[PDB]
A and B are shown apart, each in its own frame.
Chain A
């Protein structure tokens, strides 16, 4: 079947260049226009399209920022991105039906144009001297540059909020509605060799 396999996540620095690959299978790549799309925070955009045996047609916004090419010897289409800083989004490579202009097959690859790579800091945010029935405990993760994974020891009432950028690092919070409080700990797992687990004390 027609399937398009992309490269993994890329992490350029500020004003570097990132090349995104789209291997094509199941169809003659030279016969179809392979497109590219730009989804930053749930808003699909259209960088450009490339006919693997000839022309490349860009959007007026991406003139000179995107550069599409096709290595027709292989079944590979590439998008090279120029200067960066706000191009952190998810990039797709659809191909249009050879008659309509709509996109039957899609991919998905995410770029992250930031700087730095640090270890997260765990702060056990706790109660302020109050209690009635169930109580809300918490765990703050601040200052990392990857995708973390916050967990609790077998308790499923947790809410881990999406991480947000503050400066150049990511911040995240986790909240648990625990009824009884004999002992509770927040265990974070980070890709860059960080596995700190901190207990939450009273007051």
Chain B
């Protein structure tokens, strides 16, 4: 099969222009389709034969001769911040790449650590929850129970409609028997400086 490669899984753009690039593992002869998928909805055909729209808003244009294709959004709006896919229809086994847009903002992370509740402690469990509700970019969370831990489960939302900032929840599940290692700290490493360490004892 022919490998279709969209390099940037995430692109930032607010109201000016987006140029999503699709790279094909083989010369596909200008045969690349483009799909627009909002979350929870099926992919919608935008541009076939790498230049031709299908009942689509005029802002979506495309370009590309062979092995290098682009889709341009010259007027990107709130609906245009969706997940964009490129497909080959040159070879028998059809292939897709995957890419997404998001708006631009500033920065600034926030962190808060929460110990397990008494109810959870009663029923043989202890979950320490670290919340990182508002920040821009990508972030890493480290757990120190006086030593690094690698049993934490992490989850990230999409982008807030108003705040235009991401969040993160890190849950450390420990049994009651193993709940005596000292003090628990959650450390955050965003595009800032220094570890945002919040701790409980």
Contacts and interface: CB of A to CB of B under 8 A. Distances in A.
B114 A138 contact: yes
A106 B44 CA distance: 7
Given A46-B94, A166-B153, A128 B173 contact: no
B93 interface: yes
A135 B10 CA distance: 31
B12 to A, nearest CB: 18
Contacts of B173: 166
B114 A125 contact: yes
A44 B96 contact: yes
Contact of B85 (A44, A162, A166, A173): A44
Interface string B104-144: 00000000111111011001010101010100000000000
Interface string A132-176: 000010101010000000000000000111111010000111010
A173 B116 CA distance: 13
Given A159-B133, A173-B171, A175-B169, A104 B93 contact: no
Nearest to B117: A123
Interface stretch (A8-16, A71-79, A95-103): A95-103
Contact of B127 (A60, A106, A123, A126): A123
A140 B127 contact: yes
Contacts of B33: 100-103
A164 B129 CA distance: 14
Contacts of B35: 44, 103
Contact of B112 (A121, A136, A140, A160): A136
B187 interface: no
Contacts of A138: 114, 129, 131
Contact of A162 (B113, B123, B157): B157
A101 to B, nearest CB: 3
A128 B115 contact: yes
A59 B54 CA distance: 27
B155 A44 contact: no
Interface string B11-55: 000000000000000000001010100000111110011000010
Given A44-B43, A136-B133, A125 B98 contact: no
A80 B127 CA distance: 40
Contacts of A177: 133
B89 A100 contact: yes
A107 interface: yes
A70 B133 CA distance: 49
A100 B42 CA distance: 20
A142 B114 contact: no
B123 A121 contact: yes
A102 B45 contact: yes
Given A101-B89, A140-B127, A173-B169, A42 B98 contact: yes
B153 A164 contact: yes
A84 B40 CA distance: 23
Nearest to B87: A102
Contact of A164 (B41, B98, B155): B155
Contacts of B66: none
Interface of B: 31, 33, 35, 41-45, 48-49, 54, 83, 85, 87, 89, 92-96, 98, 100, 112-117, 119-120, 123, 125, 127, 129, 131, 133, 153-157, 160, 167-169, 171, 173, 200
Interface of A: 35, 42-46, 57, 59-60, 92, 96-97, 100-104, 106-108, 121, 123-128, 136, 138, 140, 142, 159-164, 166, 171-173, 175, 177
Given A126-B114, A136-B114, 4 more contacts: A102-B45, A128-B114, A171-B171, A172-B155
